Structure formats: C-alpha cells, structure tokens
Design an enzyme around this catalytic site. Sequence first.
Site: not given
Ligand code: UDP
Lengths: 443, 439, 443, 436
Positions: B14, B111, B318, B320, B338, B340, B358-360
């Site tokens: 978020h 949000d 990392v 991403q 999403w 990702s 969840g949403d996944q």
């Molecule tokens: O080690 C990481 C983990 C996450 N992300 C970024 O964190 C964002 C959020 O990911 P998402 O919401 O899809 O998964 P969540 O955090 O909701 O479980 C994405 O753009 C990823 O590219 C990243 O860059 N490196």
Amino acid sequence: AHIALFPCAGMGHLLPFLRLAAMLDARGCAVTVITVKPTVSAAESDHLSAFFTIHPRITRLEFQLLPYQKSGLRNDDPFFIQMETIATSVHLLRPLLSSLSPPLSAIVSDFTLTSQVTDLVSDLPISTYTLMTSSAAFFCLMAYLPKLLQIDVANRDAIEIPDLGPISMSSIPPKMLDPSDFFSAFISSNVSSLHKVKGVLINTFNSFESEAIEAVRRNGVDHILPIGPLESYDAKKAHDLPWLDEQPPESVLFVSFGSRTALSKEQIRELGAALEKSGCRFLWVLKGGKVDKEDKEEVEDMLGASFVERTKKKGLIVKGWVKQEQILAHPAIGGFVSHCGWNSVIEAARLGVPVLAWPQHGDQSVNAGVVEKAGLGLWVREWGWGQTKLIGREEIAEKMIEVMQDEKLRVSAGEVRAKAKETREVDGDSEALLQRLIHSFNN
Amino acid sequence: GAHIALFPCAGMGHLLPFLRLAAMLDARGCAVTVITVKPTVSAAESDHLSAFFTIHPRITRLEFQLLPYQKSGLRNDDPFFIQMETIATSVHLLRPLLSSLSPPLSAIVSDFTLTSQVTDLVSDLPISTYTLMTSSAAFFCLMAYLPKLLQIDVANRDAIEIPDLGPISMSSIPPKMLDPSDFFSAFISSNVSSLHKVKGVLINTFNSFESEAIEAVRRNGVDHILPIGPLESYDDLPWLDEQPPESVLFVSFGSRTALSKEQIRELGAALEKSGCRFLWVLKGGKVDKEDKEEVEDMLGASFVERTKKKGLIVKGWVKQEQILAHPAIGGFVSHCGWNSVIEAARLGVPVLAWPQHGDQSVNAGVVEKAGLGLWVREWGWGQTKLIGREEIAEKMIEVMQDEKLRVSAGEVRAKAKETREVDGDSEALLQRLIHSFNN
Amino acid sequence: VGAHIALFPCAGMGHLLPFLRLAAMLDARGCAVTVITVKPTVSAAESDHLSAFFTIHPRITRLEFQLLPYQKSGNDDPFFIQMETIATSVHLLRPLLSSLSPPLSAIVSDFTLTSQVTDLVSDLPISTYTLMTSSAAFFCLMAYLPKLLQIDVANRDAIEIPDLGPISMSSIPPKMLDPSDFFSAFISSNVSSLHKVKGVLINTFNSFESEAIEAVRRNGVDHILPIGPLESYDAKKAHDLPWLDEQPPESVLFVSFGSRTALSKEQIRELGAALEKSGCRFLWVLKGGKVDKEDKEEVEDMLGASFVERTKKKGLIVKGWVKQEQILAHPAIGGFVSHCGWNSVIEAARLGVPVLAWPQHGDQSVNAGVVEKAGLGLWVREWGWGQTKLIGREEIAEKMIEVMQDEKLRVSAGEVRAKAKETREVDGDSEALLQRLIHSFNN
Amino acid sequence: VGAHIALFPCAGMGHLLPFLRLAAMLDARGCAVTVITVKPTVSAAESDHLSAFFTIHPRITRLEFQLLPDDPFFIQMETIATSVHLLRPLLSSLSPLSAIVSDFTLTSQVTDLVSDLPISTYTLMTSSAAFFCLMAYLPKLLQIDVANRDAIEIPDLGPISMSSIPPKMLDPSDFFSAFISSNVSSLHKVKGVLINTFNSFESEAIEAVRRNGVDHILPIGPLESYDAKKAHDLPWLDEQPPESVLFVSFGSRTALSKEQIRELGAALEKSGCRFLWVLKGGKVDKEDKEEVEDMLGASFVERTKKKGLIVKGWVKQEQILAHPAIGGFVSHCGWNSVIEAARLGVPVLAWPQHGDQSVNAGVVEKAGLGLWVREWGWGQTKLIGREEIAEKMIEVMQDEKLRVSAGEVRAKAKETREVDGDSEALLQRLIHSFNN
Ligand SMILES: O=c1ccn([C@@H]2O[C@H](COP(=O)(O)OP(=O)(O)O)[C@@H](O)[C@H]2O)c(=O)[nH]1
Ligand SMILES: O=c1ccn([C@@H]2O[C@H](COP(=O)(O)OP(=O)(O)O)[C@@H](O)[C@H]2O)c(=O)[nH]1
Ligand SMILES: O=c1ccn([C@@H]2O[C@H](COP(=O)(O)OP(=O)(O)O)[C@@H](O)[C@H]2O)c(=O)[nH]1
Ligand SMILES: O=c1ccn([C@@H]2O[C@H](COP(=O)(O)OP(=O)(O)O)[C@@H](O)[C@H]2O)c(=O)[nH]1
C-alpha cells in the site's frame, strides 16, 4: 577498559566530551576521543590541538566526514547541518573501530550520533553510552515529544510532562514540533534508540534537578546517570584577565550568548544602550558575525568608536573567544547574562554567579526555567524568544540593575554553588556515580 | 498547478503504489504533499519514505503521529492490518493540519482502507476526494459485491457469480473475507459503502489487462473507476550480470508474507530438483523485517554449498523492479500480490503463480487468464496447505520451458507500454484527471 | 532454543520475581523467551529488578507495554490499581504480539488479568498458561470462593473446600468473604477464565502440598502443574555481608517482612526488643514504606537510636532491598523470620532454612498454616492479622529462643530441603512437568 | 552598504557576465555582495573572468560550490542542480543574505532551499523581453496546440514566426522544454524578476510579461560594465579614424562553418570596412578550441594585414565597442551583446546563428538599431553568398538613417540609466526594500 568519546559539532557539544574525557583519563581509563574534519568553527580545531598536547595519553582518532548529502530535515543552522553530515558518515567507521590495536570496551556517544553509533557497534563487543549536553528537564521534554506530538492538536497554554510541573507552550521551540525540521527528526530518531544504550550520562547533579532526574527515571529512561558538574581541563595560555583585576569584586556583569548565537542588529544596539544606561561595570563578548567564528571576520564596527569611548571606564568589549570558565571564577564577575545553553548554565551554578536568563533558540527557554527554579538567576518569561523578540533599553537596563543588586539571588546562587561542590566530593553523588560507572567499564 | 495530497495505509504494498503516483503527479506539474504516519510497522517503509523525499525534494511530506490501538469489534491477528485500523482511527487528527497547508488542497487521494474515514474528514471542507486501490479490478468486483454477499448463505456453493463477470470459485475467496467480524471483511465492506462519496476510484491496472472486469465494475455502482496502470517507478545485480539471459528463476512472496518452515524446506528441494539458476528471496521472519532476525539458518549449512553454482538466496529487501528488468530472469514465482503482478506485466516476465493468502488467488487467475503466468488451482492456498518438491519442480521447469508463454508476456508487456504512451489510454486518463483539479 | 515463549507479570515483586524465574527456567530448558512488562512500574524495585534481569540474561528479549491514563474510583491498593490499569491497556499487547518474529507457541499471563487476555488468545490463537504465586492451599480457597460466595455469605468457625483440611476464617482475609468488595469480583472472574488456559503452574511441589494438588485437581483445576521450587536468577554483587563473613555458621537470624512493610511501628519495636532478649545474631532488612519503594524516606526513625547502638556488635540492619535468596543460601544464616509471602516460603524450604512465622496480611496466614503442616517452621496462630493485636516482646522472645534451640525442627527442616532438591533433579516430578510442557509446545 | 547580497549563475558567459555586472552594480548601490560560482567551470574563459572580477573588486566576496559527479553548457546547468544542496552549508556560515539573485535555469531546485533558510530570492534573465515571454507563455502553448504553425502569438505581444523559434524548444520530449517550462512555474516564488532591458526598447514586450502574470518583472537594463583599466592594447584601434572599424563577434562560442565563415571573410574585403574580428574556434568550448586561423586561409591574412586585425580567443567587447574607432558591429545577436550595442550606440548587423538570437534580431529591427536579413536563417542551414553579404555590409556603413536611429537608441538607453529613469529607480527601490 578502553572508552571512546564521539562528540558532534559545536563547542557546546565539543567542550563537554573533552571535559569528561579528561576526567575519565584522570580516573584511569584508557581514553580515545573521536574527532572528524573539517570542523565548522575555528575554536573547535584550535581547542582539539590544545587539549591533546595537554593530555598526551588520550588517543586522537580523526576521520574526514563525507561531503554533505541530504534529503529532508529542513536546516538553516551551520552547526546543525554539520551534525547531519557526521551522522550520515558514522556507519563508515565500522571497519576502523573493529581493527583498533587497543580495542574499545565501550563508546560514549553524542546524543545526536547515538542512533547511527548504536547500529555501528551492534555486532562488535562494545557497550554504547550517550552523554547528554543539555539539562535533565529538557530530556523530560524530549522523552514526551512523541506523546507531545501525538496529542498536540491544540495550541493552548502548556503541556503537563508526567512527573514534574507543566511547561508553557511558549517554552517549547516551534522547530521541535515540526517533524520536517532536523531538530525534531534528530531528537525523535535518537530517543527511540536510547534503550539500546547501557547508560545515559547527564551534566546535572541530583541537588540541581531532583524532580527532572527522578521524573526521567520513572518515565522509561531508567539508566540516567548524573555526573555534573563537569570539570575544566584547566589547559590555557592566553591571558585576557588583566582588565578584570583592576575591577572591584562583584561589580562586573558578564554578558555572553554562547559559541554560535548572535543578536539582532537592532538588539545589539539596544543591549549596548542598556549597558550604558544601567551604569553597571561589564564585560561584553560580542559575536555579531553569527555562529561561524571564521566568517564573523568583522572587528567592532557594530557599535562605532563613539560608544567605546563612553563605556571604556565601566566596560571592556571583547570580540573573539574568551576563557569563560576562568572569567566566571573571577572575583570581579557578580552577574552573568546567558542564553542558558546548559554548559554555561552549569558553570554559572558551579561558580555561583547570579544569572540573567535570555533564551534565543531551542532548549534555552526550559533551561532558563531551571535556572529560575533553583534561584540561580532571574528569568523574564514575557521577554519570550530572543531572535523572535526585541527588548528595549529601558526594559533591559532595569533587569540588569535588578540582577546585580538581588542579595537574595547572590545568597541563593551561592547555595547552589555549595551543592555543586558536594557532589564532586567522594561522598557526593555525582563523583560517586562516575566512580561507580568507571568500575563498570572494566569488564 | 494544484495541490493534491496522497494518504497511504500500512505496508509496502500500500505504500509503494502511492509514492509512485505521487512522483507521477509531480512529473506532470502537480504540487504534491504525502501524508505519512509514525511510527511505521516496518523498517522498509521508514527507509523508503526517507529516500523518496531526498529524491523528490519538491514533493512535500506530512508526518502524523499515531494514536494507540483501540478496541473495536474486529478480529485481527496481522501486524499490517492492525496498523491500518490504527491509522484509520487517527484520521480525525488531520482536520486542523489541512486548514493550514501552505497551498490550499485541490483534492486528496486516499487509500481504500482509509477511504471511509477520510471521506468524512473533508465532507464539509471543499476538497474533492479520490481513492487509489492497490488490488486488481477482478478482486475489486468481488469487493463491491461483498455487502450483498454478506447477507446470503452461500454455503456449499462451489462458486459465486459476480454481477457482470464470471463467478469466482469459492476456493479463490478467503474465508476470513466472508466472516463479518474479521477485519479483512469489515474494512472492505465498510469502505465500499462510502465509495459513492469519492469523485473517482483509481486502480493500478490498464484497460487491455482488465477490460472485462473494468466494464463489469462500472455497471455496478462504481462508475468512478479510473485505471491509470501501471504506476511508474519513482526511482544483488553482480551475481546476476554473470548469468545467462532468461536462465534465472526468481522467487518472492512480497513485503509482508512468509512461508511455513515445513513448506520452506520443500521449496528449496524443488529448486535443487529443477536445476534452474535461481535467485531466491527468503523471508523467514513472518512479515516484519525488524523482527525477522534469522539469517539463513532456515536452509542449513549444507544446502547453500550445494546450490552455490546454480543459485543465490538472500534474506533482505531485494530491489524487485531492478531484478525483474534485468535480462537474466526468466520467470517469476509470485504470491501474485497485485503490485508485484503489475510489475511483472510491465517487464513481460513470465510468472508461475502461487497465491498464499487474501486477494492473491483472484489475482492469480487474472495472471493466468491474461496469459501472463500459469496458475494451478489444486495448489490452492499457500499458508493453509503445503505442496511437495516434486510437484513444485515440474511447474518451475515448465514456465521456463514454455516459449508461447514468453511470447504471451511480451504482448502483455507491449500493451502496458502502449498505455504509457501519450496516445495510450491510461496515460491519457491521468492527464484528464490532472486537468480537472481546479485551483 | 527454538520454542518462543512470553510470560507476562503485571505488578508487585511477588508477582514479578517468580515470573522472571520461570522465564529463566524456560530459556535454560530450550525456549526462546520474551518478557512483557507494563510501565510506568509502581515501584522502583521492579524496574531495578527488570533492568538487571535483561542485562544478566541477555538472550531473553524485553517487550514493554506503555499504560494509558486510568481514573476509576472505588484508594484501594497501588498494586491493585496498577493490576487494573494493566487490564485497561491489555489490548495494546495486540500490535506487539502480531509483530513478534518467531510467533508465540505459548504465553504465560499473571492470574489477575486472565479474563482480559481471553479475547486476545482467541483472535491470535496463543495457547495461554498462568503461574500462581500463592500457596496450593490458598489457591484452593481462591478457586472455590465463587461457589462458596453463592450460598449464605457469612463467617463460620471453618469454611471447607472439597478435598483438603478445612481453612479457618482467621486465616482468610475479611475482604475475600464480602461479595460487594473489589477483591471477590477479580478472583471470581479470573477463576472462571481458567478453563480457557491450557495449564496452570503453581510454585509448590507435592511433598509440600499433597492434599492441595489433588484437592485442586478434583475441584475444577485438572490442568494444574506444580513446578516448584522456582530456581534463582543471577544478580552479580555481594558487599552486603562483611559482617556475615565474620559471623559463625547457622548462627544468624534473618528477618524479612517481604517486598513491603508489614507491622506498625509500635509492634516492630517490640520485636526489636524481642530480638535483643533472644541474643540471636541477626541480619534485618527493613522496609519503611509499607507499600512503595519510591515513597519510603524514613531511616533510623523506625527503631530509635536506643536499639541500633545496643545491638551494634551483634546485628545489622539494611534499609530497603537486599538479595534475599543469596543471603538465605549463606552458611551463616540459621533461622528465618518471614511474613510468609509464598515466594519466600518456597525458598526457605528450598534452602532448608527454619522459619518463625508472622503472617501479616492476605494469603500469608494460610501460608503460615502450610509452614506448620510441612514442619518447616514454628507458627503462632493467635498473633493475628497485622496490627490486629500488639504482641509483647517477651512473647516474641520465647518463640525465637525456641526456634534457635529446636532440634526436631532443623531435622524436619533439613528433610524438606532434600525433597525440594529431589523434585528439581532431572528425574524429579516438578522438573519432569516443566520439561514436558516444552516438549508439547509447537514451532 | 548595510544590505548583503549574493548572485548565482550556473554556466555560460551569457549569464555570468551580466550577473557580475549585477554584482558590481549592487556594490555601487551599497550592498554587501557575494558571488557564488560553480566549479569546475565549464570554460577556461568563464574561470578566467571570475578571477579578474574579484581581483578588480576587492570588496566583493566569492563563495564557491565544488561539483559532485548533449550541450556541455546545458548539462552543467543540470549538474549545478544536482549539487544545489551544497549551497546549504554555504548560506549557513555567511557572515545572513538580505536576498539572493539566482540564475533562471536552476530556480526550480532552489525553491526548497529558499523556504528553509528564509531568503527573499530574485532571478535575472539574460534574454530579451520578447523571448522571455516565449519562454513565459511556452508552458500553456505546448499543451494547448501540440502543432506547427507559421506564426505564434503571445497574448499582448505581436506574434513572431516559428522560423525565429528554435526547433528543440518546440519538442515536448526534449530536455530543453522541461527546464524552461518547469522553471517558469517556479517563477512564482521570486519576489522580483530582472531582465537586461529597458522599457523603451520593448514597451510592448515588457507589458505582455506584466499582463501575462510575470507581474514582478523588473527591467534594469542596460547593466553597467564591470571592467579592468588600463591596458595599452589595440594600438591598431587608436590609429584609425572614428567609426571606421567593423567589429565582428559571433559569440562566447563559435557559430558558423569554415566555408560559410569564408564567405563573410571574402565579403569583408569586398565590403571595405576596416575590421577587428573576434574569431572563436570552439563551437561551444574555449578549452576544446585549439585551431589556428586556418579556416580563413593564409591568403586572407596577407591581403588584409593592414586593413584589419583578427583576434583568436577572447577580447573585452564593451571595451572595444566603446571605442571611437568602432562604427559597426556584427553580432550573433546574443542579447547580452545586443544590449551592449544599444547602450554604446554602435550600429549593428544581425546574423543570429542559433537559439534566442533570431528573436533578438527581430527586436533589433523594431528598434532600428541594426540591419537584419531574415532569410539567412539558422546558422549552417543554408549558404549565404559573399556578394549578397557585402551589399548589406556596405549598407551598414553608409546608411545615414541608421546612424540617426542608433544615436537616439543610445540616448534612450541613458535616460533610463540616469537617476530619474525607471531602471535606475527600481534598483534604488529594490535595495531599499532589502531588509537587514
Ligand atoms: O523484497 C521486495 C519485496 C517487495 N518489493 C516490492 O513491494 C511491492 C509490494 O508487493 P505486493 O503488494 O504485491 O505484495 P505484498 O507486499 O502486498 O504482500 C512490489 O512492487 C514489489 O516490487 C520489492 O521491491 N522487494
Ligand atoms: O566566548 C566563549 C563562548 C563560549 N565559551 C564556552 O562554551 C561553552 C559552551 O557554551 P554553551 O553550551 O553555554 O552555549 P552554546 O555555545 O552551546 O550555544 C561554555 O562553557 C563556555 O565556557 C567560551 O569559552 N568562550
Ligand atoms: O527484600 C527482599 C524481599 C523479597 N525478596 C524476594 O522477592 C519476593 C517477595 O516476597 P513475597 O512475594 O513472598 O512476599 P510479598 O511480595 O507478598 O510481600 C520473594 O521471592 C523474595 O525472595 C527479595 O529478594 N528481597
Ligand atoms: O569575445 C567576446 C564574446 C562575447 N563577450 C561577451 O559575451 C557576453 C554575453 O554574450 P551573449 O549572451 O550576448 O552571447 P552568448 O553568450 O549567448 O553567445 C557579452 O556581455 C559580451 O561582452 C565578450 O566579452 N567577448
């Protein structure tokens, strides 16, 4: 036991750390003092060299800090800007500290560098301690800042800190409440990592701030250790003493506003007008140029020749660094005018000088309060913020007269002076605590 | 030439999307303020906020201090979700701060979780409210319908029909979503009900990607949908520069989700079985980076030494976006969160979809339906059920193997590119949106 | 140490110390421990204790819960208002518990708040346990109070709990027998929330309380586990017994009235007179402040100059806190005078030190009863609730002399110590359960 | 002299020379002036000029920012932006500024800076009022039309043809557009704006900027020369008769090809004007330029050795223009140069190679300052014949009206220069506004 001191920028930060370091060395710890270059002010550089030649067994660790790199923390002050520069480069010292020939048992860090320093010794066998430059009462305000920021929706009167009298809203600096500014971000970032510190050193004695020292102890900073007042490293060659010797005792009024504080062009002329009007003997340290000593390259063209002639009988005006602790000790000085930066304040208390309180910026207002509370000096709240306010000659002069002649203050001030002595004594709490602390250092 | 404020909610998923937009608005001449809150749940969020501001100095940042967590009915056992509840109570704090903003606010982008409370905050203040939604449209369609769904028994139903789109399987709906008390359900339900009070609902997806759902949402109340996907980056490699192109398999489960210890052992075994050169990002510390102090004690001393030739595994944040862009990576194993997924489309990287929670799962389907990645239903929910190295291995190989899949992703990649183009619809929408803001 | 365990003590030394011990016990046995504390602490001592625990035991993490403002009326006790202010902020454990890395396999919560965490253990399914700091016979009375206070609420010679020696009403506190008092409501409600608990640990063993363990097992607490005696934590010091070294073995009487002051000043003086008559060499730890460490500022004004001088060569008095467990362990100590707080009683049995029982308040009288039955100590029933009666020095002296010269008692007391060890030994029954509980816990 | 002020130009002598003159002018008016400079400087000349300036004015302080890691001048302007924060320490240590006057190019970056260290800031534009509006009206224009038309109109300003407008400025994609459009938006922060102009030269242009929301524009033109004195150079200048010499300078950078430059060199001898020619080899870089006068040919030098002199490198333009000997000026028409011509009352011929200059040529035409041929166009685009040039070149020498028109223009420039006139008046006023 090897202990390393890491002061930040400023003679207010620098002076206390060196002073303690000399005390530690006197009491037998192996001491290293960490300095970085360049330094903002000429005095810090000049001082460091003097300190080391006087204390040979203290090691000097020098690191050139990285060029100023930043994002955020709106800062308009040179000393604060240097603090940010030191803090962003502290993480690059991990390689050097790991390989030191006599390894450090512990580090006594500056409050501002505590967060970065705490991360630095995480996987090293080094205890982390922090020395607090300011008063214990300000530390209570620092501890309450998260609570103060969260429940500070309304601009009304004062906020009651939990274990002592409520502080007026006028006393809290507006910069502290703004999270974007460096003063707030640094205060908040460091208090969060204070829990990773073995102990927090303070420059106040138990007699001076019983409520403030006790309130912090029950407010989560349970490791506070009062070691104040700090003792001078008594290293000095230049003598500016001669005019004073001519002066009768207690006649002279000492005015100084710290290492890097300057008055308004209207204020310098109104303060000078008051000194003449009062009729008092005086010693004025003029720092018109501003914080940096190097750029304050002017030479008494602030007042003009006309004024010096009028005042020469009753006053000496000095522009430059003055040996403040020595002047205060002199029989001649019976008054002090201060921005109430703590180190001046502690010195006034140790040497028993009556103080006239005049905050310009930051903690000065609260400390001014402490100074009033203990009888050390007279504070006029209505004057408010120097640098945000202007006070006329009539108002200034009367106060100057009033402080010089308060016998209750002179009697009251002395009592604090005695208490500061007791604490240094072997029985006295402050020395005892340090002695207690020093043993701890041996591991 | 207007002031627009963006207010995100807890977590990286978020937070990153909001920042990318804030940068995006700034790029287009918008004055921007970002309303952050203290303290953060995670180190990454704090780290990212500071960096963002040093890079985009023009952008203002507004800091809020959180009130303590407050008893309410809702059931929550997740650190990030809990923070969301805390942030939500705290919105009313905002009122006095808004009245003194240096340039008067034109609008506030809030949000979805913060939408109900924010809409009430400015109901009197002359400020247009917009909301930005992290998840997919397909999920969004599920969300919109939840309030109706909450009143119907819907038990023993294999699948539930969604009003202008094909019914989702019950399997792909989280059970906690359908239990009213639980926070996940309550926050989605409560916010939708307030959606009418928002001028627009921003979705991080594009018309080519989500076209059927995007229409479907429109014809069922939420006509204020504005897909402007995919959000741009506001803005571990050394091992990678050595690798062959497409030869590397990338495994990540996002910023706030961790895998069970038993499950984790199986995954490594599969990677060994697969033989694909791989970069594995491991989170053993469930969710929090501050509290995930374990450092590869999860795999074992022997494991890494065997896999050193064909793999690199790291525990830590990392980058991403940069890892996906790099030529070497040939697949993504994703929870299908999403943001990702959306980056996966942008860089046309094939994804093997393994929804965890969840949403996944709904998101996972869109990944397959789009032809972006392959998802196997039988695997179902991760963190509820565990699957073998043997099963995992075949699927891992296949994604690398499939050339049609590689081609499919590229079409997805181009379409994403097309929306960015000035001619393209999503870029056009943001600009149309910008014109509207009226100082 | 794979399994992740957190124990939560709310308030009081008596509650705090045992929980820390359980924590240490768990870590030694392979749990990974988080200890939860609520600040601000009522007393300086808990804080003093807590900081040392974490510094001494550094593999155990400290989770703190900052309490919110409270204001309820109906001044009771400072530890009871703190026990109810921890329940007014017990929902603040939600964010903390969700964030914990290795998630909790089990949490051990003080019995005072078991009803408030019930909801928290359902949302986050933490198998929850609780450790009782009272005696097994007094917990029986606590555990049947609800069913006893349904029937005609009044006082008889003896009230009886299902399967144990009837408890007299002179041992039962009067506030526990009125159903409109605060006390009963908190006890009745937390005994009802014992059914959601997976186990109930108590600080006793079965040789010490054979009937109570089965009475509590056949009356609704089938998941009760006696894991006594609790082991001792470390502290690192000892400049408290320079006199203790000079004194001969088993010749010194140790007088402790617990974490807090007990009897009235007038009563104490008679003991002081009593001590003198006896000739027992003694180490006395006096707490002036009846309930608060912070509040006690009296010193030599408790007993008078008259007494302190006369016993100058035969006994020593320490004001405030002493390491009670370390002292008792010393070869010099030969007798114990106790207020019979349960934690103190279990160590005397554990250390094999003979007891003279002077229960002051609350559960202590029943504990006095337990001490008598065990053969651990000499008890006089008629001495009564503290300050109820004034006990003459002569009467006090006689029991004390009797304690010094009573051989059967030492033999029985010596026998108790061997049994306590027997349980602690690896084959031991109490030892077996603690080992077992860990085996159950799931990662 | 109470007030304390600082100037900041990023790059080019197009900006620095005016800024320094601004710095000197400010010192004259009783201002403590600090000049901030960026290092390393892109050009050896840029560096050369600075050392001289401080040395010539002892009492003007110099503060510098060392720099951290397309056009060199544009990119560097970009680099200064990167390192702008470096400014932060400098301001903090100052012996504090009543105001700072900053370059247009980097105004957007500083906005954050001004707000934390509260400093009223100003910018000074080295381009014409007509051109500034084209920059000024540019942001709206780009989004609204997104097309190419023969002429473009700025609200209260007579439309000037696209032909004058630089191509790059037209493209939305281009870096140049981002800098110009963004900066004007930042134009809102400044408490004043300054351009090297006077109302009389462009009453129409100045008004449109006033009309168009640049309400705070101040025209302080012409800027007084900050100069060295006294060097015995150009014995070749004193010798000649008054108004006998044509001085040619295509820039503070090169502007045309050797073959195109050869046509003027051949045109110059046919024209018969005596000349002092400033010939720069480097297209944009003085340090890069290491070519001798071989573009013109050996033959040209032998034939004309008595007639005129060629200076490879730099020369003091104001110093040369002021001379009695000079009667004609050939200009690439950079505004700073054009303004110099009007103040010195020396007839100009306008041959603008690039950028803002063609628009600048248009202003010269409205003014009557010089003769211009529009058709010649952007430099190197087309080849202009030696025969065609001379007729214009001779005409510049022998046109009586031009001398008259030029004479007035110098007269007009002075009136603003004098105390009654507005440009002088505003300067007096702005300084007065400045608060200690
Ligand atoms: O080690 C990481 C983990 C996450 N992300 C970024 O964190 C964002 C959020 O990911 P998402 O919401 O899809 O998964 P969540 O955090 O909701 O479980 C994405 O753009 C990823 O590219 C990243 O860059 N490196
Ligand atoms: O001219 C001066 C000014 C200051 N000090 C010393 O600087 C110390 C620190 O000053 P303080 O902290 O009181 O004020 P600050 O400089 O931090 O604002 C004082 O002990 C003074 O002794 C000095 O020796 N000479
Ligand atoms: O001066 C003291 C008093 C008590 N204790 C220890 O702290 C606990 C307090 O005693 P208890 O709870 O039995 O009595 P109470 O707390 O009810 O007064 C016991 O375990 C003692 O071992 C101690 O170490 N020093
Ligand atoms: O040989 C030369 C060329 C140019 N200039 C100066 O260049 C300055 C600015 O030139 P302008 O901005 O008009 O042209 P540009 O820098 O854009 O090429 C004017 O003050 C001229 O005096 C100079 O002094 N000597």
